[PDB]
Amino acid sequence: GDTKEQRILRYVQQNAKPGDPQSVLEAIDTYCTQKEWAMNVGDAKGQIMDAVIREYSPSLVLELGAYCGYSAVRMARLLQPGARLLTMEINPDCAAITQQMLNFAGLQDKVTILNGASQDLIPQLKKKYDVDTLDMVFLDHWKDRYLPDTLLLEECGLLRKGTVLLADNVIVPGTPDFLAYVRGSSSFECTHYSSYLEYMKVVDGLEKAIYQGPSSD
Numbered sequence: 001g002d003t004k005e006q007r008i009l010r011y012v013q014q015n016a017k018p019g020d021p022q023s024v025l026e027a028i029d030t031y032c033t034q035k036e037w038a039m040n041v042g043d044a045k046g047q048i049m050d051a052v053i054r055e056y057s058p059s060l061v062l063e064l065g066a067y068c069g070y071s072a073v074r075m076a077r078l079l080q081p082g083a084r085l086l087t088m089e090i091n092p093d094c095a096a097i098t099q100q101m102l103n104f105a106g107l108q109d110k111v112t113i114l115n116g117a118s119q120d121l122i123p124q125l126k127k128k129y130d131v132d133t134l135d136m137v138f139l140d141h142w143k144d145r146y147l148p149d150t151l152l153l154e155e156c157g158l159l160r161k162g163t164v165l166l167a168d169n170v171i172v173p174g175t176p177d178f179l180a181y182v183r184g185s186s187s188f189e190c191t192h193y194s195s196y197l198e199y200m201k202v203v204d205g206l207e208k209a210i211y212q213g214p215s216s217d
């Protein structure tokens with residue numbers, strides 16, 4: 001048997017230019033349109049991601065929900081020399097795919113992959129991976145986990161004033177708990193970027209929530 005992630009990686013390895021992230025991203029994009037399937041972010045959302053990374057130029061990025069490494073290849077190619085991406089994947093096999101995917105893209109020295117569940121890994125980040133603070137967090141895992149993982153980062157001390165949270169799919173299927181909190185909390189300064197997946201009927205969006213640091217008085 002051959003899973004379909006294995007087939008995407010086998011397509012990349014066969015049709016993309018080694019060491020060239022853009023070529024890798026286009027091979028995956030092309031396999032998806034032909035074999036009718038899709039990664040966790042599309043092109044429109046990629047461009048939103050691209051702008052955020054370019055605007056804030058983060059030295060340390062956490063991604064929750066790697067899948068194939070498509071989004072890791074997307075973000076890590078924009079990282080400056082010295083900057084690194086930590087990405088979490090809960091499914092062992094997908095995590096493995098993501099590593100092979102990064103290896104082939106040449107971005108493997110910038111990205112560390114962690115196989116595990118976010119609520120187990122986030123607490124170990126300081127002690128076991130020498131994280132002080134995160135500069136940017138991309139959330140694209142389980143919807144019910146967005147709001148509690150956010151406060152888990154908060155409690156663990158992994159956010160500093162200026163940390164940028166970028167949450168995917170806050171509209172479709174929606175993360176209404178998470179949205180309400182960052183939009184209502186004084187600890188965040190939010191902005192919504194809309195992604196038009198289909199005219200009138202499928203209109204999603206990412207939420208960019210800027211941590212404002214603990215209060216003072």
Ligand SMILES: COc1ccc(Cc2cc(-c3sc(C)nc3C)[nH]n2)cc1
Pocket residue numbers: 064065066067088089090091116117118119140141142143145
């Ligand atoms: C619709 O359901 C899904 C939504 C997103 C994904 C991709 C994914 C999510 C994760 C999780 S979940 C968790 C507590 N920690 C992590 C790192 N790893 N990979 C898989 C299924």
Ligand SMILES: [K+]
Pocket residue numbers: 040041140168169
């Ligand atoms: K997504």
Ligand SMILES: [K+]
Pocket residue numbers: 057058059
């Ligand atoms: K920086």
Ligand SMILES: [K+]
Pocket residue numbers: 182183184185186187188189190
């Ligand atoms: K707010």
